Amino acid sequence: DVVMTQSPKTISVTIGQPASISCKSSQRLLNSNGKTFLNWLLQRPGQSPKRLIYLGTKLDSGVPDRFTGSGSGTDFTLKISRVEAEDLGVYYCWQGTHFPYTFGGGTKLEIKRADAAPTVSIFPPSSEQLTSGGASVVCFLNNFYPKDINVKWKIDGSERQNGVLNSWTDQDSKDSTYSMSSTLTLTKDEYERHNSYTCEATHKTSTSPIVKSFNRNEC
Amino acid sequence: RVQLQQSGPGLVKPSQSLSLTCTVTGYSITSDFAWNWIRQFPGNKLEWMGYINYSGFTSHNPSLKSRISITRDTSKNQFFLQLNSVTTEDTATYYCAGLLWYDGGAGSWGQGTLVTVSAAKTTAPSVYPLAPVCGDTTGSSVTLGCLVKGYFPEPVTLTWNSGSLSSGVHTFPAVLQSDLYTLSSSVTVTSSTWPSQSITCNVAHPASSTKVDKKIEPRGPT
């Protein structure tokens, strides 16, 4: 099968700057009628891939003219003249010349922006979940930059790492930040045993962690 | 323009078959296009599965060798995917996508439908409200939450105030443990507006045909 190699894996670009990515195929993509079936696609977070470029160098239907496709034979390039935050996501190349048709592994375009500390919010278990005999403590770490961040949980001043589950968002196109959710899950009986629950986030934006706490049985 | 929408069961038992439908509007499926099935793996690798073109002629990836049938109903303007002998390895997001036969242009993809191949049972979620602690309400902004717990399979849909509250929302990817998923969502608003203007989590789990609309109540007197 034709192998499509996209480089680089990831690119981080400042809004207003240009971006260039490459796709190289293991076989020439020109056909017997002079057409080159090479498409470029963008997949934004949460959506399906959408058209950008086709026939190697042609702008697909309704695509902003900020996208340009170049190359021939086996080596192809996609350029964005000026990157906007909505351009973030994963870019793929695709070949339709040799059966079976194949996709590049994708290149993720990230937006570079000013650092931002997280907004940390912690939430006790709900009264309904407590009647269930299970108890989740939730902590949101919202709208920070860059994407690397630590969160630690404490119960009565002592770190707890068991029963913790985390989930991160894709970069947000509105402000180019990242958000993260952390959940500490216990039995209702263990929760009802302790008083203080603490969420601690460590981000490069601060030499001191961001700490949010509450006491069981206190508003 | 032309629009595509996938439908079909989102949960399939191992060794049975996946069956999907793509409904096309804005274009007749007997003209101009190749109607493709493409799937995306959790990794995020995309695989071309096959097509049926405007004349009925088909082609598919040899990687699927013999498990796949691609058909159409021209009276209904629909085309179809059947994939047999499935395993967890076929768990993915399935997309239908039309491309012009002539130049591969005008790529148009449906929304994507997740298909889970699993023996696990359909479980409706519990939707728990995440009310802010008192000490965190005295600021100019306040953050409220909603925890969707113990459901199967994906997905759920989550909105705030039936979708009229869309700004300042963060809905996080579900996390799977022991064949149940847990998802949370946060919503941040101007502190002065709450609780005068109520905030409700609307959660739907089509697999179990269940919906919950959970008004977030403050801690303290309500």
UniProtKB/Swiss-Prot annotation, chain B:
It is found in: Cell membrane. The lineage of its organism: Eukaryota, Metazoa, Chordata, Craniata, Vertebrata. It comes from Mus musculus. Disulfide bonds join 146-201. Residues 125-217 form the Ig-like domain. The gene is Ighg2a. It comes from the Eukaryota. This is Immunoglobulin heavy constant gamma 2A. The chain holds residues 1 to 102 of 398 of the full protein.
